[PDB]
Every structure is written in C-alpha cells, then in structure tokens.
C-alpha cells in the first residue's frame, strides 16, 4: 500500500450531550406518534391518510401500521423539505415552484409565485455540463431530429443501434480498459449485472456503506454475503483469511470465487476508498474487484479519469469498473468496463441486454459530446479548466467550513461535503431556514443514514463562481449561529 | 433587546426538545405536563426542607 | 485448531475459478444486429434495407413529427440531464404533468413514474409483498415479474397457464392451510400477479374469473400491461376496458412506456392508498435519477395524440386480424397467439431433440427472409435463468404503419421460406 501523495481524512466523533439530546427528541416524537395513532384509532379526528375500499375491508390489512409508523408521524411532519419541484435548468441557479400546505404537509397546494435564482447545492453537475446551450445541446437536437426519441426493442433484438457501438468504443478509449458496454440506468446496471458474474457457491464481501443497488444485486444472486467494516483494511484482511481457510459454511468446501464490492466515493459518508491497500490485498489473496465509480468518474483526477488516476494506479488491476453518466456527464445511463472476455460474456448473458430496452439516442449523443469535450478531442481548452475549477472550489469550500467550526466528514479532496446536524427537528429547521435565505440544500435522515447521524449534503460544481460560494458561506455561517450547529472543538 | 433574547431561548428550547415539529395543541399538552411534574417535584422537595 | 503453517499452506494452495467462464459455443446472440439509422418503417439492417416487422412500435408514434417537435422544445427549455433523484431537486414540472395526464387517461386517482421500463415492475412487487406472504403467479409471466418476485422473500406458487381450475385448486389448498393455523393466517397476505397480454405466448388472461376468484378467496390482484396498455379496447385504456371490468377491482396496474408510447420509462397506476407507498419503498424510485424531461414531454405529446385519434386502435386491430388469418396454413410452422394480439409467435410444429438445431433453423429462416427484405427477429431468452423456458420462436409484430400490401407480401415471403427450409 503505497500512496504517492498524503491521504487525509477526518471523522469527528459525536459529542455525548448531543447524542443524549437526539435520543430524547426521538423518544418524544415516538411517544407523540403513539398518541396520534391512538387518537386516529378511536376516530376522534378524521384520518387524512387514505383507507382501503369498503368491500376490501374484509381482506387482510395491506399495511402493518407500525411498519409505516415512521412515515406517518415522523416523515410526514417535515415532508416539505423534500420533493421540491423545479422549473428551470439545474445549473448554479435554479427556479423552485413555491408550494404551501394547510393540513400540516398532508396535501400540498401550489401557489402562483415561483422563487427565482436560488443557489443550488442539491444537483450534482460536478463538471457543469447541465446547460441548455452549447455544442452538446445542438448535437443532441440534431440526433433527436434524425433518429427520434426512444428505441422500441432490446439490444439482442433489432433494438441495437450504431450510436451504441460508437458510445461503447469511446468509453473503452476514455477509461483505458480494453472494452466496455453501456446500459439504461446505473441502478439497473448493478441489479442486473451482479447476478450474472457470481452464482451460488461464491462469496461477496460488501462494504458496510454500499449503495442500495449493489446490495440488491448481491441479494438477487445466490452468493453468500459477508460485510466488513467501512474502510477498515484489517477487517477486510481478517474476512479474506477466514473465508479462504475455512470455506463454505454448511460443508467446508473451498469457495469458487471471492468478489469484493467497493465504491469510488461514498455519497453520504464522503470518504474516498483506500484503493492501493485494497488492490494489494486482492493480489495477495487472489480475489476479484468490482469498483463502483458513480460519484468519482469525473470529479477526481488530474484530467478527470477517475479515482484510479487520482491514486496513480493501473486501470488493468481492477477487474470490473462500473460507472454512471448521470452524476457528471449530465445524462442518464450506466457503463461497465473491463477485459474483452468479460464484456463478451456480459453482452451474451446480461439481463439488461436481453429483457430491457436500449439507451436513447439523444442521451448517447450528449454523452459522446461531453466525453469528447473532456478528452480534449473537441479542440477547446474547456476540458482542463473545469476540473481545475472544481478542485479549487472543493478545497476553498471545505477550508472555509472547517474554519467556522462545523463537523465535516470525509476526505479533503472529496467534492461532496456532508455537514452534521445530529438532531431531528434541526433537519427540518436547517432546510427551511436555508431556503428562506435563497440557498437550496439537501438534508438526509434515518432511511439513508443512521439514527444519530443526520446530515446536510453539499455537492460542489465547476459552475459555481467565487461570489456564489461567498454568499452561500455567509448565509451558512449566519444559520449555524442561529441554530447552534458548531459542534467541533478543535478549531472554531 | 431582552425580548429577542427570551424569544431566542424559547426557540432553542423548541429546537432541542423537538417541539418544533409538533402541532400547537401538542406543544401545549407537553408544556402543561412538564410544568405539572416540576411543581410536584418542587412541593415534594419542600416537604424535605 | 489449525496450526499456522497449515493456514498459510491452505491459503497459498487455493486457486479461484476465472471470473467469467470461456464461451466455446459460438452463440448467435454474440453476433448482434447493426441497425443504421432509426429503427422505423423501411429501416436498414446490416446494410440491407428492410421493412420493420420486429420493433415494438405499435401505434407508429416514434417518428411522428409532433412528438419530435415537443421533445425538441423540452430539450431547449431544460436540457438533456436531470441531475438528481426524485427527492433531491430532481422533480420537474413535466414529471408532475405527465403523472396527472396518465392518471386522467386511465381514470385512476394516482400514478407514479419510473425512469426505466424493467425497474417499475421489478420494484413494485417487493414494496408491497414481504416475507411470509403467499403469491400466485402465472407460469408464462415475463422475466421482470420473476425478478420482482425473487427480490421479495414471499413464497411463490406457479399455476398453469390460463387455467382457472388450477388457481381455484391452489386457493382451496391455501384456505385449508389457513383453517389449520389461524394465528399465522391473520398475518399472511394473498396476491395474484397476472399479465394483461403475455409477451411469451401472446394470449389474453380471463379477467372476469380472476375478479370472481379474488372476491371469493380474498386475494389482491396485481395486473401488468406491457403490451395491452396501448393496443386493446375502444379507447386504448387496457384490458380492463376491453373486458369491461371496472377499474376499481384491479388493485395496481403496471406498464412500460417504451412499447406503445415509444419513450423510455414505465409507470404504475392505482388508488392513492396503494400508490403513495411506492414513493418511499420503491428501490427503483428513491435511489435512482429521475426521467429526463425530453422523454417525459415526448410521452405527454404521445398521450395527446392517442386521446385525439381513437381510430388507430381499430386499424391496428384489423391489421392484426388480417395478418394472423393470413399466416394460417404454413406447412412447417405453427402460429401461437390470438387474433387481437399485436405481437405473436411462430414456432416449429415438430421440434427436433436439440434446442440448438431448432434455433439454427429459425435463424436460417430469419436470414433468408432478411435477404428478401422483410426484417424479422427471434425471441431471446436466458436458458438458465428462466424459471419456465418457452420454446424457440420467431416474433411477428404488427404496426399501424404497415400497409395491406406489405402484410400480404410478408406472409407470402415467410410461407415460401418456411416451405423451402423446413422441407
Ligand atoms: C426525523 C425525520 C427525518 C425524515 C428524513 C426522511 C428522508 O431522508 C427521506 C429521503 C428522500 C429521498 C432519498 C434519496 C436517496 C439518495 C441516495 C443516493 O445515494 C442515490 O443513491 C444516488 C442518486 O440516486 N445514487 C446514484 C448512484 C447510483 C445510481 O445512479 P443512477 O442510475 O444515475 O440513478 C448507483 N450507485 C451509486 C453509488 C450512486 O451514487 C446519489 O449518489 O446521489
């Protein structure tokens, strides 16, 4: 495990008092949820939540009440923060359709007004390729006029198209691997291509904080799943040793294949994977590697090749290289890159290839234009400046946040910046206060984070200029002072 | 400026104890229960003195 | 218990199998079809211009100029990419407008949009059904339904194809087991997952008896209409409009917008009570990026076209009847499907023992027809993954675009080729 350049990350532990207060607040909310449920049971107040039809009342209840308890009494109260409609290009500035509710977020009524010029931090657009003008838009318009929108058959059938061949060849050239294949959706990519590789009698070592798509793909196949600690190479080595030595659980027969699923950048956690150590362990113990570069395909690297170029490693060491075009290139889709035999086997035996529709032509045109812009084949110098600007923005933003005193997670080079709130009511309060001051942010709760750790995510971009960051930082400082969100003791 | 000070203290109370998410009558119920318990504890303590 | 030296010896002696097995089979699926230009009527396949009898484009809305103009306007206004999940600043006005349009078109309270055709019915089933429930699914259900059922841990029972006595027998066995253990009985939920118009066989499910069985044995019905959504019924509402069954009885209707609407993505419609759950418990919904606005606007314009002109369903029905009646009489093949079905199958009448030889014969027929300028495809399956593997078949798809003369000439071409090869 050799690092060319220092690897710095910090995950400050939660204060004790804050954890106690979080538990107290959650307990109070749960008790009042019980009280509301009991009141609704006796029909003292009408239940705005819909009920099943009269002739279906004799049926077994479709929903167990306690299963939806969290949605009914916790999520419904602050539902206004999420699912905010927008009506403009999701660039640096976005327009949000205003909405208000009269029955405490049970039903939403759209009012006439629309908020204009909101500073946007939710959308990804890391390299700032989400614009309605440019060469990409014109090429997409031409391909839309010629080919049309959508295709009506699977790839193995007549649904295959030459644009797909061009896109696959371009992706193979871009990554550095021998061959690659494209897909409609990255979630579909994982859920439909994890089962193909591994079958019953194989082991899958899945990281603790893996994406939902990876977990679903692992579950669909029959392979045994064991989970190691997040970015803890000692845990991974211990699991590899035990799995290789002892073998299959029921009958101690040797494992057929051992597959390790890791991600480039964890969206919620914000930590870059320790790739060189993982590759060293994989070579020493003869495992296979599946690298998910959804959040790191364009953000990281001297020229934006990915995390592999970030660490200076060889692209051939990673057995499977999955990626998603949505986060950076500004178009939906997915891809897998690897050696020629792997791609041939995937073309023959993938679920998406056989039973799923191909990718839309305008989307593949926009992806091709974005890639030829980054690679420098366009002739413009815009390829390098976008990456340099993204790096400067990330470093400046993280340093300014740390100087104030907020708790911040992840590696310093990571563009995704999670800020820690730690309390239930503060999740809603921070979102509402930020929206009031003309900044749009995203906050995440228990469904996607642990109960204690509730965080607000920022996704930096190359579109943001310095003045936008300055105004955002000033407003964030004011709101943090308002709600007392500065928990960090080291530097405040 | 004192009124803004006590308003801010009450706002911090609401944020800490998660009353911010609750409806006004639920807040009133919780406050009444809390003050009743506090008064009971006060009299029980005065029993000791 | 093992000593150390034995542990390193065990570790070093181990040799994993290759990641992907070698493929010394020369799969036809390995050789794809290269289509130059759009896959429309009078397309070019492998450098040879042919009439498209393979693409799932029933209403011919893929190349309608209005759809392209609307998509171009949406592209100019918003851009190609959405850049976010549905929860996090990924919901546009076009998405809500499309949901409203679908709800009003199907006369249903609510509808939800999935960004990928497979994912909608791959994720609808696990959301409602959990471990311990019992689900009765048709044998000939598509692969998407099978994967959806496998994702959930619920017990699965496969009843025979379009046999209602078998379903009643299964339900009666389930009710006697229910009488055996009431405490477990009060918790277990019964589902009947059925497909509107089957992709694999091209037949139509008997909905009225399904409704009777549901109301007699208390099982919730999930209906999947991937093909029947835009081809059946007076106004193209679905199979519910075809039979006349009240839409209230069906609990959830799933569909994909790729086949008829010619746009990527799928949807699910139902009452608000059942639909609202999917916005939180749908894996394909919460954890994936939203549909690009361009495709949504294309779908909305397609819906407007469908609402304005309801005679396209009639001409599609009459063309399906015409071609299905014309194809009857081939010496070496058999037609598998119903007259109302737009897409059906041609299968070997008497099959040789080896599946590979039958696939080779069908591929030879397809290539010989392609040289004759009629483009056909072959049904593609996964031999190992499929729970019930259908026999090999050549897919025949009918479109409003194709004229009567083209249908007659295609029938005569296939007839001559089949007599030439199967002899
Ligand atoms: C006290 C009460 C609190 C209530 C809180 C309720 C709450 O938080 C609910 C949240 C609503 C929406 C949740 C959205 C979750 C997003 C997770 C995020 O990681 C996504 O998975 C993303 C974007 O979808 N993943 C993208 C991605 C993919 C798939 O990409 P596409 O195919 O293009 O869609 C696959 N793998 C990986 C690793 C990623 O990142 C994301 O990363 O943003």
Coordinates of C-alpha atoms in Angstrom, one line a residue, chain A residues 50-53 55-56 58-64 68 71 75 82-90 96-97 110 120 122-125 130-132 137 140-141 144-153 155-158 160-162 165 181 184-185 187-188 192 197 211-212 216 219-220 241 244-246 254-259 285-286 288 319-320 326 330-332 341-342 344-345 347-358 360 362-363 366 440-444 457, chain C residues 2 7 10-21 23 27 29-30 32-39 43 45 52 54-57 62-63 68 71-72 75-89 91-93 96 115-116 118-119 128 130 143 147 150-151 153 185-191 214-215 218-220 248-249 251 258-259 262-264 271-275 277 280 283-284 287-289 292 294-295 298 375 377-382 385-386 395:
Chain A
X50 CA -56.5 7.2 2.7
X51 CA -58.2 4.0 3.7
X52 CA -58.9 0.9 1.6
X53 CA -62.3 0.4 -0.1
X55 CA -65.7 -4.1 0.0
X56 CA -62.0 -4.8 0.7
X58 CA -62.7 -7.9 5.0
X59 CA -59.3 -8.5 3.4
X60 CA -56.1 -8.8 5.4
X61 CA -54.7 -5.4 6.1
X62 CA -52.4 -4.4 3.3
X63 CA -50.1 -2.3 5.5
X64 CA -48.9 -3.1 9.0
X68 CA -45.4 2.9 8.3
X71 CA -43.6 7.6 7.6
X75 CA -41.6 11.9 7.9
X82 CA -38.0 17.1 0.1
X83 CA -39.6 16.6 -3.4
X84 CA -39.3 20.3 -4.2
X85 CA -40.4 20.9 -7.8
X86 CA -38.2 23.0 -10.1
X87 CA -38.9 24.6 -13.4
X88 CA -35.5 25.5 -15.0
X89 CA -32.2 24.0 -15.9
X90 CA -30.5 22.7 -12.7
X96 CA -38.3 26.5 -7.5
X97 CA -42.1 26.4 -7.7
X110 CA -49.1 25.1 -5.5
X120 CA -28.3 25.2 -6.0
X122 CA -28.5 19.5 -4.4
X123 CA -27.9 18.8 -8.1
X124 CA -24.7 17.1 -8.9
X125 CA -23.4 18.5 -12.3
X130 CA -26.0 20.7 -17.5
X131 CA -26.7 23.7 -19.7
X132 CA -29.5 24.3 -22.3
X137 CA -27.3 20.7 -26.9
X140 CA -28.4 16.3 -29.2
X141 CA -31.0 18.3 -31.2
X144 CA -33.1 13.8 -31.9
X145 CA -34.3 15.2 -35.2
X146 CA -32.7 12.3 -37.2
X147 CA -33.1 9.2 -35.0
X148 CA -36.0 10.2 -32.8
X149 CA -36.6 9.9 -29.1
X150 CA -36.5 6.4 -27.7
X151 CA -36.0 3.0 -29.1
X152 CA -38.5 0.2 -29.1
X153 CA -36.6 -3.1 -28.8
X155 CA -30.2 -4.8 -27.7
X156 CA -30.1 -8.5 -28.7
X157 CA -33.1 -8.0 -30.9
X158 CA -33.4 -5.2 -33.6
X160 CA -29.3 -2.4 -31.3
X161 CA -28.0 0.7 -32.9
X162 CA -24.8 2.1 -34.3
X165 CA -21.4 1.0 -30.8
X181 CA -20.7 -1.8 -22.5
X184 CA -30.0 2.3 -19.5
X185 CA -29.6 3.0 -15.7
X187 CA -29.2 1.1 -10.7
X188 CA -30.2 -1.3 -13.4
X192 CA -28.8 -6.8 -13.4
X197 CA -21.0 -12.6 -12.6
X211 CA -25.2 1.7 -2.3
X212 CA -28.7 0.1 -2.3
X216 CA -29.9 -5.6 -4.2
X219 CA -29.1 -10.4 -2.9
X220 CA -30.5 -11.4 -6.3
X241 CA -8.2 -15.0 5.6
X244 CA -10.2 -18.7 2.3
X245 CA -9.2 -21.0 5.1
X246 CA -12.5 -22.3 6.4
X254 CA -13.5 -24.2 -1.0
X255 CA -15.1 -21.1 -2.4
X256 CA -15.4 -20.9 -6.1
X257 CA -14.9 -17.1 -6.4
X258 CA -14.4 -14.3 -4.0
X259 CA -15.7 -10.9 -5.1
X285 CA -5.4 -13.3 -1.7
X286 CA -6.4 -13.9 -5.4
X288 CA -11.7 -10.1 -7.8
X319 CA -11.4 -6.4 -12.7
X320 CA -14.8 -4.7 -13.1
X326 CA -25.7 10.9 -14.6
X330 CA -25.2 15.3 -17.5
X331 CA -27.2 12.3 -19.0
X332 CA -28.8 9.2 -17.5
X341 CA -13.8 -11.7 -22.4
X342 CA -15.8 -10.1 -19.6
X344 CA -18.3 -10.6 -24.4
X345 CA -19.8 -12.7 -21.6
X347 CA -23.1 -9.0 -23.9
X348 CA -24.2 -12.6 -24.1
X349 CA -25.6 -13.2 -20.6
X350 CA -26.8 -9.9 -19.1
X351 CA -30.4 -9.3 -18.0
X352 CA -30.4 -5.7 -19.4
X353 CA -29.1 -6.9 -22.8
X354 CA -31.9 -9.4 -23.2
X355 CA -35.0 -8.2 -21.4
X356 CA -34.6 -4.4 -21.3
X357 CA -34.8 -1.5 -23.7
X358 CA -31.7 0.1 -25.1
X360 CA -32.0 6.7 -26.0
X362 CA -30.1 11.9 -27.8
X363 CA -28.7 10.8 -24.5
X366 CA -24.9 14.2 -25.4
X440 CA -31.2 25.3 -1.7
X441 CA -29.7 22.4 0.2
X442 CA -30.5 18.7 0.7
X443 CA -30.8 17.0 4.1
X444 CA -30.9 13.3 4.7
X457 CA -25.1 17.4 1.9
Chain C
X2 CA -5.3 -25.4 12.6
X7 CA -3.1 -22.0 7.4
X10 CA -4.1 -23.7 2.7
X11 CA -4.1 -20.0 1.6
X12 CA -1.4 -20.4 -1.0
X13 CA -2.6 -23.6 -2.5
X14 CA -6.1 -22.1 -3.2
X15 CA -6.8 -21.1 -6.8
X16 CA -10.1 -19.3 -7.7
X17 CA -12.0 -20.1 -10.8
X18 CA -12.0 -17.5 -13.7
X19 CA -14.3 -14.5 -13.3
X20 CA -16.2 -15.4 -16.5
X21 CA -16.2 -18.9 -18.0
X23 CA -17.7 -19.4 -24.2
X27 CA -23.6 -18.1 -29.6
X29 CA -26.6 -13.8 -29.5
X30 CA -22.9 -12.8 -29.6
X32 CA -25.7 -8.5 -32.7
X33 CA -27.7 -6.8 -35.4
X34 CA -26.3 -3.4 -36.6
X35 CA -29.2 -1.1 -37.4
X36 CA -28.1 2.0 -39.4
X37 CA -30.5 4.9 -38.9
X38 CA -33.7 5.0 -36.8
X39 CA -35.5 1.6 -36.3
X43 CA -35.2 0.7 -41.9
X45 CA -30.4 -3.6 -41.0
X52 CA -39.6 -3.5 -39.8
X54 CA -39.7 -6.8 -35.3
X55 CA -39.7 -3.4 -33.4
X56 CA -42.3 -2.9 -30.7
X57 CA -43.8 0.2 -32.2
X62 CA -41.8 7.0 -32.7
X63 CA -41.4 9.1 -35.9
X68 CA -40.2 15.3 -32.1
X71 CA -39.3 16.8 -27.4
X72 CA -37.1 19.5 -29.1
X75 CA -34.8 19.9 -24.7
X76 CA -34.3 23.6 -25.4
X77 CA -36.1 24.6 -22.2
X78 CA -34.5 22.1 -19.8
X79 CA -31.6 20.2 -21.3
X80 CA -30.7 16.6 -21.6
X81 CA -30.0 15.6 -18.0
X82 CA -32.0 15.9 -14.8
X83 CA -29.0 15.6 -12.4
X84 CA -30.7 14.2 -9.3
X85 CA -33.1 11.7 -7.6
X86 CA -36.8 12.4 -7.4
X87 CA -36.5 13.6 -3.8
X88 CA -33.5 15.9 -4.2
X89 CA -34.3 18.7 -6.6
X91 CA -38.7 16.7 -9.8
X92 CA -39.6 19.0 -12.7
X93 CA -43.0 20.3 -13.7
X96 CA -46.0 16.1 -12.3
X115 CA -37.2 6.0 -15.2
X116 CA -36.6 2.6 -16.6
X118 CA -37.8 -3.0 -16.2
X119 CA -37.5 -1.3 -12.9
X128 CA -46.0 -4.4 -1.1
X130 CA -42.8 -9.1 2.3
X143 CA -38.7 -12.1 -16.7
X147 CA -37.2 -11.0 -10.8
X150 CA -37.4 -13.2 -6.3
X151 CA -36.4 -9.8 -4.8
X153 CA -38.8 -13.2 0.1
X185 CA -53.4 -16.9 8.8
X186 CA -54.3 -13.4 10.1
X187 CA -50.9 -12.1 9.0
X188 CA -50.3 -13.7 5.7
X189 CA -51.4 -11.8 2.6
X190 CA -52.5 -13.3 -0.7
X191 CA -51.5 -11.8 -4.1
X214 CA -60.4 -12.5 -5.9
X215 CA -63.7 -11.6 -4.2
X218 CA -59.7 -12.6 -0.7
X219 CA -56.5 -12.1 -2.8
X220 CA -55.2 -8.8 -4.1
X248 CA -61.7 -0.2 -9.2
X249 CA -61.5 -4.0 -8.9
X251 CA -55.6 -3.0 -7.2
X258 CA -41.4 2.1 -24.3
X259 CA -43.7 -0.2 -26.3
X262 CA -42.2 5.0 -27.8
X263 CA -40.5 6.7 -24.8
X264 CA -38.1 5.3 -22.2
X271 CA -55.6 4.4 -5.8
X272 CA -53.6 6.9 -3.7
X273 CA -53.7 4.4 -0.8
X274 CA -51.6 1.8 -2.6
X275 CA -49.6 4.2 -4.8
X277 CA -46.3 3.6 -0.6
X280 CA -40.8 5.7 -0.3
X283 CA -36.0 0.9 -4.7
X284 CA -36.0 2.0 -8.4
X287 CA -32.3 5.6 -5.3
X288 CA -32.3 6.4 -9.0
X289 CA -32.2 9.6 -11.1
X292 CA -35.1 13.2 -18.4
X294 CA -37.2 15.3 -23.0
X295 CA -38.7 11.8 -22.8
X298 CA -42.4 13.1 -25.7
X375 CA -36.9 -7.8 -41.2
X377 CA -36.3 -11.1 -35.1
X378 CA -36.2 -14.2 -32.9
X379 CA -37.4 -14.3 -29.3
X380 CA -34.4 -14.2 -27.0
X381 CA -34.3 -15.9 -23.6
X382 CA -31.8 -16.8 -20.8
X385 CA -32.2 -18.0 -15.5
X386 CA -35.7 -18.5 -16.9
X395 CA -41.5 -12.9 -33.2

